[PDB]
Design a protein around this ligand. Structure first.
Ligand SMILES: Nc1ncnc2c1ncn2[C@@H]1O[C@H](COP(=O)(O)OP(=O)(O)O)[C@@H](O)[C@H]1O
Ligand SMILES: N#Cc1cc(-c2cc(C(=O)O)cc3[nH]ccc23)ccc1Cl
Ligand SMILES: O=C(O)[C@H]1CCCC[C@@H]1C(=O)O
Ligand SMILES: [Cl-]
Ligand SMILES: [Cl-]
Ligand SMILES: [Cl-]
Ligand SMILES: [Cl-]
Ligand SMILES: [Cl-]
Ligand SMILES: [Cl-]
Ligand SMILES: [Mg+2]
Ligand SMILES: [Mg+2]
Ligand SMILES: [Mg+2]
Length: 264
């Protein structure tokens, strides 16, 4: 029913967020292990992001998919808001990529398949994530990808602007430009992730914000020699300036490079 902080024993920090921290926690009666995303009311209020927090909570609450992190509940006290999340025990894809440097084709196709299944479910409800990046991709007990952090999620179509000075690396041209956008934004982010998984760095990475913006807007990227023909084909289809030219998620799931390398 109605949770309070006294119902949990808090453990180690699991990760740092923009508006507070995520902690491992145990519900006192059941001993059930979960993650508490803690946000500071004063920081949320100064930034004026309460409306986006309401969307994170309302959207994530109603999603039910094995590759989407569950949001079980929420509560608040005088200074903080607490999101009760499903705990992802194998950490982030971000950490996995720092350890391994780059992923082989099998691990990449498997993660892309899991991501495409999760996004296909979101898009069936016109929910667009818009913040698909390695730090927001968690790993379950079976090493399965779980999409998390619905902080920027909205119902499609939308023209809302997400980050003002944060990383642009995963954003499509229509989002960085402030244009109307839809489900196709997640398809572009899928292409950026596929490239980063195989190469170790996102395709439009640059020293400055303006140079990253320029690269994204002109779709300026090249492949290192080791990237195979099949991976180049899928990435080139996803990274199209025109969102209408981006494939459907069923086309990604049936791509010959995906079917040849996916774990299933
Ligand atoms: N349920 C979870 N299980 C494990 N680690 C988590 C969980 N949720 C978040 N984290 C960790 O905390 C970080 C921040 O959480 P996130 O929800 O993305 O916050 P923010 O909206 O501030 O980005 C993640 O990038 C990850 O490192
Ligand atoms: N549970 C919960 C929750 C609480 C707030 C909130 C409440 C108040 C309040 O009722 O006083 C003040 C606030 N300032 C920033 C957030 C915020 C927003 C979302 C959720 Cl999910
Ligand atoms: O910290 C959060 O969960 C969200 C609060 C609303 C604004 C966006 C923000 C985020 O995920 O970046
Ligand atoms: Cl605002
Ligand atoms: Cl380690
Ligand atoms: Cl919305
Ligand atoms: Cl140039
Ligand atoms: Cl241009
Ligand atoms: Cl070549
Ligand atoms: Mg995050
Ligand atoms: Mg977030
Ligand atoms: Mg990097």
């Amino acid at each position: 029913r109605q949770w309070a902080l006294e119902d949990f024993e808090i453990g180690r920090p699991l990760g740092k967020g923009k508006f507070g921290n995520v902690y491992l926690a145990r519900e006192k009666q059941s001993k059930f292990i979960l993650a508490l995303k803690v946000l500071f009311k004063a920081q949320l209020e100064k930034a004026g992001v309460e409306h986006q927090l309401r969307r994170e909570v309302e959207i994530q609450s109603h999603l039910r998919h094995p590759n989407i992190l569950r949001l079980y509940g929420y509560f608040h006290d005088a200074t903080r808001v607490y999101l009760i999340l499903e705990y992802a025990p194998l950490g982030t894809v971000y950490r996995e990529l720092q350890k391994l440097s780059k992923f082989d084709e099998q691990r990449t196709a498997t993660y892309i398949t899991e991501l495409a299944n999760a996004l296909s479910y979101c898009h069936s409800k016109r929910v667009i994530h818009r913040d698909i990046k390695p730090e927001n991709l968690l790993l379950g007990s079976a090493g399965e990808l779980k999409i998390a952090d619905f902080g920027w999620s909205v119902h499609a179509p939308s023209s809302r602007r997400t980050t003002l000075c944060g990383t642009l690396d995963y954003l499509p041209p229509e989002m960085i430009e402030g244009r109307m956008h839809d489900e196709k934004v997640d398809l572009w982010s899928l292409g950026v992730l596929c490239y980063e998984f195989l190469v170790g760095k996102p395709p439009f990475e640059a020293n400055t914000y303006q140079e990253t913006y320029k690269r994204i807007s002109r779709v300026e990227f090249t492949f290192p020699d080791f990237v195979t023909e099949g991976a180049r084909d899928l990435i080139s289809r996803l990274l199209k300036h025109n969102p209408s030219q981006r494939p459907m998620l069923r086309e990604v799931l049936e791509h010959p490079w995906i079917t040849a390398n996916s774990s299933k």
